[PDB]
Amino acid sequence: HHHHHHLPALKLALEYIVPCMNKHGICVVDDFLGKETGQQIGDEVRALHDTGKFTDGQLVSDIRGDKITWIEGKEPGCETIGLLMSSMDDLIRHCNGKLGSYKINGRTKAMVACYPGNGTGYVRHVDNPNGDGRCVTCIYYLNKDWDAKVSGGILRIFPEGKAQFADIEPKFDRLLFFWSDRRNPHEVQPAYATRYAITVWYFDADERARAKVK
Ligand SMILES: Cc1nc(Cc2ccc(-c3ccccc3)cc2)nc(C(=O)NCC(=O)O)c1O
Ligand SMILES: [Cl-]
Ligand SMILES: [Fe+2]
Numbered sequence: 001h002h003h004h005h006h007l008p009a010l011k012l013a014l015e016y017i018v019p020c021m022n023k024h025g026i027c028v029v030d031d032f033l034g035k036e037t038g039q040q041i042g043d044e045v046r047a048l049h050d051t052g053k054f055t056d057g058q059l060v061s062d063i064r065g066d067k068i069t070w071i072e073g074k075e076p077g078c079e080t081i082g083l084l085m086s087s088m089d090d091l092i093r094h095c096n097g098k099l100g101s102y103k104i105n106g107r108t109k110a111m112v113a114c115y116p117g118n119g120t121g122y123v124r125h126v127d128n129p130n131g132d133g134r135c136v137t138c139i140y141y142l143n144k145d146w147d148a149k150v151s152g153g154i155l156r157i158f159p160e161g162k163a164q165f166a167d168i169e170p171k172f173d174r175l176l177f178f179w180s181d182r183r184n185p186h187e188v189q190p191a192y193a194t195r196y197a198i199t200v201w202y203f204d205a206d207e208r209a210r211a212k213v214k
Contacts, residue, residue: 013094065120133208153191
């Protein structure tokens with residue numbers, strides 16, 4: 001619909017992501033890339049799944065019934081995942097220096113995750129409990145016409161010492177940010193349909209450096 005227009009990265013970062021993160025430690029951004037790019041992402045992820053590039057989750061870490069694959073972004077057939085990753089980077093670049101006291105200087109590759117339905121989820125956990133440098137978790141969802149009433153698969157976040165929790169449906173073209181540390185324990189509710197997500201973690205220069213030394 002031609003009546004809608006994309007917020008530039010700078011505008012989205014400063015008018016929404018930065019305040020939202022500093023206040024709530026969680027930020028949801030819908031309609032990040034648009035339908036075409038989102039569908040292409042979905043295609044690429046399904047291809048990775050179909051061509052058997054995923055490793056079982058309970059082998060990497062029971063905790064989980066998921067399976068994952070790491071994507072650098074430049075691999076043949078992963079170009080659109082590459083663009084997603086660069087788009088994530090753009091947002092973060094416009095945030096850097098305003099997300100708490102963090103100084104973002106790098107990130108992980110993208111972890112593509114698949115919950116193959118059939119009741120698979122992920123128990124309550126913290127992404128970075130041992131201060132390994134990862135300060136912000138960034139997740140992109142690409143599940144066309146997801147209905148959590150039927151399929152479940154809600155990400156529930158329990159921000160530390162808050163009287164509220166957050167239910168995030170893994171909606172098509174939804175982007176999510178949250179603090180990676182103990183401030184945000186979270187769980188994936190059982191999924192009853194194939195559930196895909198793509199996650200990167202951004203590093204704090206200081207913590208990352210201290211993680212490697214000590
Ligand atoms: C598979 C998987 N695993 C983890 C935990 C976790 C993963 C990776 C690292 C890590 C990363 C880079 C270097 C070292 C460790 C640490 C912890 N949380 C989720 C999750 O919250 N999902 C939410 C959702 O999908 O909506 C998940 O799906
Ligand atoms: Cl508010
Ligand atoms: Fe997690």
